[PDB]
RNA sequence: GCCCGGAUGAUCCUCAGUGGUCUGGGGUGCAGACCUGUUGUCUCGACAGAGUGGUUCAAUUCCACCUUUCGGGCG
């Protein structure tokens, strides 16, 4: 009786989740999120005491290990024509769904983007996500053929335009000082060249490696309302960033913005292959969603769902703070490391995730030093340095991009990439300053 | 030193499958299972143990409930611009990736398509994998605008041809005694109407409810192959059906196939949330596979690799023989309750999995008992019942049927579905028959 | 039923919600009756039910601080969740018995663990068993305590009457406890090796009553030993007024072993029937059942163990009974007759085959012996070099007897070790059908037996 | 380190297998010096290790019949997954230390972990350590296993020598193992009670030594209460000849108290001393360490035990060894100092302000006691109602001790129960700084202190 | 004057934090002696960013001025 009425604890923790649907501030103890669980399982079909099933979709798991590790979920989220709708079959999982959306909701805005309207969870990666909003806008604008694109060399998002059918108008960018930004001039000239018309939407991105920084996207988005064009931001890696955030938020103020898509591994710390579709306008985002053919997996919104859970708010805040520190401390080490080999940080403070750090001193073409450092740095277990040699020619689905990792067709040096993304320790700047720091004295030969 | 050796066992088995990639005959037992899982899991960057990480996508995981959940298995499937490709940042997902399709390539062979000469599991469901089929042959075809697609009342196969943005021509079933069959002629008037060339493909359906059948894949291929026109088929719950791959093994042997799309919920018994893309032309299903942008999910690739190790060719095998069973005892039994409420079972001989009781003596018109025995039917806890009246009109993305759900707009009768799928239990008939039986007796009234 | 509550239902959320109701009934009604369920329970009901338990234990509470020395503090998540948060052990530290105020929930699964322990144990074949507990020690430990709760009854006794079986757990409980055991030795009768009951009674009369503590017999054992006279034993103990303590380690699967126990308490005297928990439920090594027919003798041997204990094993076997559920457990006894007559078949046959035999031992409903007459030891060691061979092979619990075999055990010399007496006829070889036994377990054995045999023909 | 190793793949799938190596590395360095690693191991690691020791038992093979009655049969596959597949118990039924031929894996991971609890008993402050063993009893029953193995070398001994401290599972322990408490009452030195060392010696001199089975030493205890003085107990029994057992049931985290065994060890006799898992370690109720200097009389007290005993507690243990390191066991011991400050600087404060004090008891490092001579309980009960009101409140493990409660244990009768005399000057309420425990354990239980005694003011 | 029930969470239950999306803890129930001004991110019932005039992106009530005032100058 003291402990059935200390039950109340936890089922007051979990009324509050559902009632006002916003993070806990500090998190959940794994009891009480288990606890939950088990509570929202139970309440689908497939889990009944007394059920029998005679469809074709039942829900029905072979192996015990695959029940338990997805907490007995298994009929996915959404119906057959609508993702968004609830499933009378598996009432538990809808739920699970809802709360996660709202959560995520809640997320976003705290983490910048205060006047979303709405967004929801889709488990494919941003890449695709991209594409599932390309796909809408088609239906919207069927005279359009053409994606503006400031140029940024990464293969998802780029692919993400053809995949969707589409044809992609690459807009270089233009230098100034060390950084890549937008060119302003050239999106507009195009647009007029090409007319409004035949525009699907201005594809833009927030979160990059450097030496890009984060499009101007106040100024897109004035174009964008101007001429009556949509326009998609692909925020990959920006929900961890106040700066992009910003962006998306005083864009939206100033002028246009249809979409934003951000990742769920880059941005939550779970696995691959989730993403978030938000935006402003409300009924525009439920149309994306009723473009989606199907149910589609819970994994990624329950990886989300217990995360958030776990962290509280709080926990989530604490790691957007950590993640600022670990970018000035990796900063300072990048240029006192750099000063010793007589390369520099490059200049770049538009960017507040991405770092890059000069190879002037490696000839690449006579001794092969800028490639053989990315080489150094894998095998001496060095994750996520990103290593860009000069003229470098590549081909991605037919176009072919001069200067290929640089994002133009001829950056100054070649460079290094780092970054200070959500997660990160001490230990990893101090072992990827000490390793790097070998495999440079070692170059040196 | 007796165990060391006895290790040994457990390593020649995990040698066998690396080796010859197909199925193990018997399971696995689960300490096998488990120790190959961690051995792969290591092998990603993120689980290294002198690791460190300056990149954006790192596999860092918040929530040691995620991570355990899935064997700590984070960075996903693929590379940025290659779903297909090896990631070096996690060569122990790229393992595990390679060994399921190679397993699920195995099973598609026993269980009946023995020339299948590709496949690959991807993370979206099967109206999804069906549009990127779609989005995969627009840039093959660029002058195309229709689908030619017999029809079947699933709002997911429909929607996946809109989402991809391509009109689906709807063409009407014949009524052949009790059963809907593919309407051979119209196929090839509209192909003759329409052009060739305006044909992005041929959109077919072999599992399906009752009483449609499965299409005449050896007709329609055989169109396809003729007029040079691309030939999909929807085999969204048909792995399980010997009938249903014999189609496609004789459809390709006759005539063309282009791609067959499966579901892995409806077919191997894990969540909601993947399907298998599977063909006979090898570099079309990798070109498929080359239009996905970005990483995707391995979980669905895991339930796979778990479920299948487990149950072993053999496990798989007795599934399938089992599900034979199951349906001749509950056509059985629907026959012989159906003869007391002066109903029957549908003749639909060519339908192997679905089964369809008549519901005369209910008048939806006046009492409404048609809906209400769905209903009933759903508060008793009979899961997958689909009940299906008269005249019911629908919009789907715009395009307006008549007699929803049934197929065809005028079927003789409403009826009742009911089907024997992977892992029905006698249980499921016995309390289906007995609560169907309490709900008939109580809508007499 | 589900029923009554579809036709309130139909007069989307509510359809889950009362699908709680559904785990509800089956765990109100374990707690209300104490029985096992007939069927299984579901896993997700199982985790349910002890999720509820493990939150009604302090140190799993939200708003909880702890200032003591004892708060149930866990270091590592993997100890803490492979024990479901159950962190506080059983009992008081005056009473392992006793509800703990700072665990109520695991309290409760104490009480509801030695319920269902209970109602098995009845419908093993002890249909009039008192009263039972579930201890944390092997059967070993746990008939010592049974000695040492005897000790204060009976302050003047040195020795335990004890039917020899070689077995070193049971041998040395005795000794741990502080007491003498006096070996009697077996008669052969026939092929198999029975009490001597009159050797018994000499003893008794030798020693004196009052000098004994009990007499400690044993049910369940190797071929070609046979259980005890436990009625003709319990007879001598009601009259000599000494207290007889049953080794039933693992009978409860033998419902001849336990409607042996149940017959020599009609008759008779037992005290206490004490049972290993992985040997009967299958469940890890560590735990044991005290059980008897005087309530109070019961509790008064709960009341004798000093301080908290492991629930570890208590969790593991409610875990057990109520997956497997009365009828589980009913199907894995009825499959260990089977493979019992099974065994023997595929014994007789094989044994034939060799000039060998099946000795005959029909009061033992486990264990089998083979004769390995043809194998010399004294020259060419070939007896001693089967057991090896079917260990390198993979076979377990393959236990081979020779002759003549000496052992210390605690001082005691033994002659004839492993064969339960000094010189049985020949040399031979165990084998037995315990619970969990699958047809593939047999069939494998007999195949390995043969190419140990053919090999040892060199 | 991996430098060379990068040198060397710089001579894609070998990067991977190539980083096997490195959990191997660490894996061959625990059981090849058996010491705790200095920093945690990650899970991955520690969850490799151990499906590696359980394939080592012949359970777990692939290829296995068993044809016995103790197989390691497991019928709930979440019974089985829980304990890693570990389902063999440690040591044969001859030998709790023997090495499992039937289980080789269990038997390894029973060797380590005694390995590595040496190593931190070592760590903890008594480095002159010959010997421990785990032993999956509380420390009650593991007393109790003590004094069993005194028997035999002590057959005319029927007493023991006991400090006073109200516990009833030492105290207890003295009984189940069949020996008579002698109750040394404690003298009263300041507001800390103390050893009486003069009513030791008195009574070891009118029963006389041969009589005296051991004496019964205490060193973690609650405040005021203090621990025993191990060095002039321990000359007393050098001198007489008495083997001496010392009860340090959570000190194992304090280093006073270790640095105290030790040296009592150094300059006198010490036979055993026995802690507790869960208090010391943080892992579930229900397991022990027996360590010793006399490395052969620790063997016997290991070898007394009969049969096979339950794996859980020693793979809590080295799960948590394991994933702390002994670096992260030092962090958590000199925590508990700090927070044993700051425990008191809080019960200084709060105490100043209810008209009370911190009672002076600077010779117990982990209890403290406030006073509560405020309160009256012959008039209005205010006292035994603060226990109940402070456990409403979820204040757990705050002990509230009054004036002249009376108790019974196991017919022997306390006055002044839970305090250690039978009169102590006031009634007093109690708090620990344990292992584990982190600042808002304090801020709440002060808060809520303040709470209550604001309330008792009606 | 002038379980200048600074309950000024009806912007200096004052009468802590940032009806015209919060005039959590605890001067309870069921600048020129008065004057003037002052019901975080980016470089039955119905109608009326401030926890969540139900500047800036009908509810205090269910910067300028005016969980009024101060349980200073003149179990
Ligand atoms: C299973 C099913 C599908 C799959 O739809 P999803 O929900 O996307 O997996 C498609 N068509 C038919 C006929 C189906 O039964
Ligand atoms: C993370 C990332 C993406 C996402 O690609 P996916 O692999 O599909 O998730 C897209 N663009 C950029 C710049 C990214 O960093
Ligand atoms: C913990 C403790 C014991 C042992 O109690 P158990 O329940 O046997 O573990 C004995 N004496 C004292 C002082 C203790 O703190
Ligand atoms: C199992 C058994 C025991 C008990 O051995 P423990 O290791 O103490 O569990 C004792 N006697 C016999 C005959 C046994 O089979």
């Not at 923790?13 to 103890?29: F, T």
């Not at 009556?228 to 998306?248: E, F, R």
């Not at 708010?313 to 401390?329: A, V």
């Not at 990160?424 to 495999?439: A, E, G, N, T, W």
């Amino acid at each position: 009786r003291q402990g059935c009425e200390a039950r109340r604890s936890h089922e007051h923790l979990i009324r509050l989740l559902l009632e006002k649907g916003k993070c806990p501030e500090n998190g959940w103890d794994e009891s009480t999120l288990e606890l939950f669980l088990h509570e929202l399982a139970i309440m689908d079909s497939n889990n009944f005491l007394g059920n029998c099933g005679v469809g074709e979709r039942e829900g029905r798991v072979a192996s015990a290990l695959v029940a338990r590790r997805h907490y007995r979920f298994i009929h996915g989220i959404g119906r057959s024509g609508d993702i968004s709708a609830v499933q009378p079959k598996a009432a538990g999982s809808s739920l699970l769904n809802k709360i996660t959306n709202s959560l995520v909701l809640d997320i976003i805005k705290l983490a910048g983007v205060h006047t979303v309207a709405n967004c929801f969870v889709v488990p494919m990666a941003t890449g695709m996500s991209l594409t599932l909003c390309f796909l809408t806008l088609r239906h919207k604008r069927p005279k359009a053929k053409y994606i503006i694109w400031p140029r940024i060399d990464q293969k998802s998002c780029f692919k993400s335009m053809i995949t969707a059918g589409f044809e992609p108008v690459v807009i270089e960018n233009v230098l100034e000082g060390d950084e890549l930004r937008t060119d302003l001039k050239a999106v507009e000239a195009k647009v007029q060249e090409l007319g409004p018309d035949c525009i699907l939407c201005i594809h833009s991105t927030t979160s990059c490696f450097a030496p890009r920084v984060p499009d101007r996207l106040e100024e897109l988005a004035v174009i964008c309302a101007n001429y009556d064009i949509p326009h998609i931001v692909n925020n990959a890696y920006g929900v961890q960033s106040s700066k992009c955030m910003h962006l998306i938020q005083q864009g939206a103020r100033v002028g246009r913005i249809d979409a934003f898509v951000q990742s769920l591994d880059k941005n939550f710390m779970v696995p691959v292959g989730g993403a978030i579709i938000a935006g402003f306008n409300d009924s525009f985002i439920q149309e994306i969603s009723k473009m989606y053919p199907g149910r589609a997996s819970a994994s990624p919104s329950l990886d989300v769902l217990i995360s958030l859970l776990s962290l509280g708010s709080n926990g989530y805040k604490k790691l957007l703070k950590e993640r600022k520190e670990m970018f000035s401390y990796l900063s300072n080490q990048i240029k006192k490391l750099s000063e010793a080999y007589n390369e520099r940080l490059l200049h770049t403070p538009h960017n507040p995730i991405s770092l890059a750090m000069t190879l002037k001193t490696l000839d690449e073409h006579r001794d092969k030093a800028v490639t053989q450092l990315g080489s150094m740095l894998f095998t001496r277990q060095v994750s996520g340095a990103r290593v860009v040699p000069l003229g470098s020619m590549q081909t991605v689905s037919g176009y072919t991009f001069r200067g290929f990792m640089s994002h133009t067709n001829n950056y100054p040096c070649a460079y290094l990439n780092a970054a200070s993304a959500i997660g990160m320790k001490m230990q990893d700047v101090d072992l990827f300053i000490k390793r790097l720091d070998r495999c440079l004295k070692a170059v040196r030969k």
